[PDB]
UniProtKB/Swiss-Prot annotation, chains A, B:
Binds 2 divalent metal cations per subunit. Can use cobalt, zinc, and possibly also magnesium ions. It is an enzyme of class 3 (hydrolase). This is Aminopeptidase T. A divalent metal cation 1 binds at E242, E308, E332, H337. InterPro entries: M29_Exopeptidase, M29_N-terminal, Peptidase_M29.
Amino acid sequence: AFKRNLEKLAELAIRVGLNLEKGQEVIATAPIEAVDFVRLLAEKAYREGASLFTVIYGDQELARKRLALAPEEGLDKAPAWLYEGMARAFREGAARLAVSGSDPKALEGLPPEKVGRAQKANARAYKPALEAITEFVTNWTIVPFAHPGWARAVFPGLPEEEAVRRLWEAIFQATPIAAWEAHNRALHEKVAYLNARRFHALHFKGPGTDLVVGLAEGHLWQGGATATKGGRLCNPNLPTEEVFTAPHRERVEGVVRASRPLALGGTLVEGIFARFERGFAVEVRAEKGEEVLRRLLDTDEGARRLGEVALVPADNPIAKTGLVFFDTLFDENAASHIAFGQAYQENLEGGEAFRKRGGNESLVHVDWMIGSEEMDVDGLYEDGTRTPLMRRGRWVV
Amino acid sequence: AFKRNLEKLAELAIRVGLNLEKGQEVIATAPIEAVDFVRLLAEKAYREGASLFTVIYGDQELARKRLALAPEEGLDKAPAWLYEGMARAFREGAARLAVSGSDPKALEGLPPEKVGRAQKANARAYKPALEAITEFVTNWTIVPFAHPGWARAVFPGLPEEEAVRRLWEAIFQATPIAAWEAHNRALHEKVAYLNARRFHALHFKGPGTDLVVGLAEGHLWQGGATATKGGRLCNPNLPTEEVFTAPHRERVEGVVRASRPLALGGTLVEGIFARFERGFAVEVRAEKGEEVLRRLLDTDEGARRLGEVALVPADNPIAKTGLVFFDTLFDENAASHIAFGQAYQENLEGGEAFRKRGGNESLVHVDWMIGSEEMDVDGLYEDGTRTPLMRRGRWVV
Ligand SMILES: [Zn+2]
Ligand SMILES: [Zn+2]
Ligand SMILES: [Zn+2]
Ligand SMILES: [Zn+2]
């Protein structure tokens, strides 16, 4: 009944997510608590040509016991060898699947001073891997399934057996081949429009919002299926409903107010609000967790500037459920969003000529949603003429 | 009650098996079906200084689905990157724990032609790792716990819930830091004795036995904790109760009769009996499976010669249980044993000068026990003077 779906999901993760070519290895990252799924995938991975399914499970309880028992000035250790190896594997042609779905409240009750000291070191070794993935070298994807740290957070509906029972079902909607085939087309179309009109800036307007997000010079809109070395499709993110590009470093004046909460690694930031001036967020605030957010955005200069503008129709699947998934992948594609920090260089058509064309450079990349069911969006040309792009959250084309 | 043991086991695996030094990473190999244990270990790993517990789970069902669905001429793939990485990690100082306990009958019902084609490739990439471990560079160990492929094979006692219930308990005997600390000393002592007295041969005598196992020239007795690149302890085998060295290729005259059965890869060889002449087993026989044993020992010349003499007091733990574990590791350390085939070169103090000093060379290494509760053992010098070593199975020192 539902097992017939779970299958399709998995089946899909491969024939579409990775578009796995016969005789291609498949390294996969996943949570030690979803083995049963891994296998389900593997099976389908191999049924498609996969020559080797290697999975590296990541247990949180393992790290949980680390932070609480490991010696300080000792956490600075990282699985360098592993990661640096995964890189090689990637560059040599190995595909990269990755199951996502973590429990935000796993590191709860633990000194945040340390947790950082540990992750700041992890990312330090993982870097060469990330690069291999950020810069599409191999075909990678990200499928997600339940987790008693999700069904337990999305729905606070006692039944854990049943929370998953619900959540597992939400994913069967948010995630067929013939609907996805006509979805990547429906995207590449908007992505074609937005690139051709060659706007000068977008203008969000709604309850409490009024932002003029300028756009970078020779900017370039991304969205949907990506090209893998020459001509080869593959949907990196499974939920994917967004379209985006880099705004302009110094051209975003206005006031913009949050729509959906922002799960910033455990702590919950709600009702956030920011005021922009000549591209700089001169005033960031929030009903809850103001302290935390302000710190992250005080990292460097670029911290308080924008590096990504994204349009997500609020009539989409992840949106119809109307829930908080405290997960980037899921929330990011929930509703139109804006993001502070570094702008993916994959958005500037075509180091120093970057900061000139309008690219923003920083350490952090925070995405918070602002799009909603009452968010109207127009697109302006350099002269001021404005073409309607979105209304009450829906596309007008 | 028993959880108080499981703890000690785990606790021990670290304070004695690895002798883990503070701030040392701990890579660990283990079966996806014994997570609960891994954690138990991890906890203790970190409670001891461990700065990072990284585990790589190995699921058999995963490989099971590979062989049966993966394309042929495609299995030749190996987790090169992973293994080659584990190597680096080892050479750089990372300890290496490894949980063992596999189900022999997991690859049952599958074409052996392929299974080989896959493992022959695995060992090909793993090699550099093995080398790092074979040649003690870091402190490594091997702890073992139940598995429904063991408790289901050791005891064919329906209750799987209870098979483990038994097996888990067998291990608590065969395998606590303060008892192991005074056990490795109690060994290194015998190992010191046996090396100093510099015998010319041992003489086993008992019911049906009368063998004069000469000893190799400049032989060297091994036993207990090993040295890892310079000065670093680590107990490779967890049950370990033996002490041994290489006999002399051409100097073992006598008649020796089996005490305990010999599990030779599935087939059960019982009551075996062999007659030696000038070092050659001129007559090997057995109540059951004679056919099988004779073949294995007819591989080459060295096949029917000895390459290891070991002394195991029959008043030991694995012995007090009085069971057949149809596992080398467990049986080998059950009671004094002798072994046909290749002699570990780690036993000759200090290629051609090997076959001269008395080293035996061959393809097979079969260990069958002969020691028992009524096995008296004396040790002879080159002149004939004999010093009593063991009586009724116990040491006399
Ligand atoms: Zn985005
Ligand atoms: Zn983003
Ligand atoms: Zn032995
Ligand atoms: Zn042996």
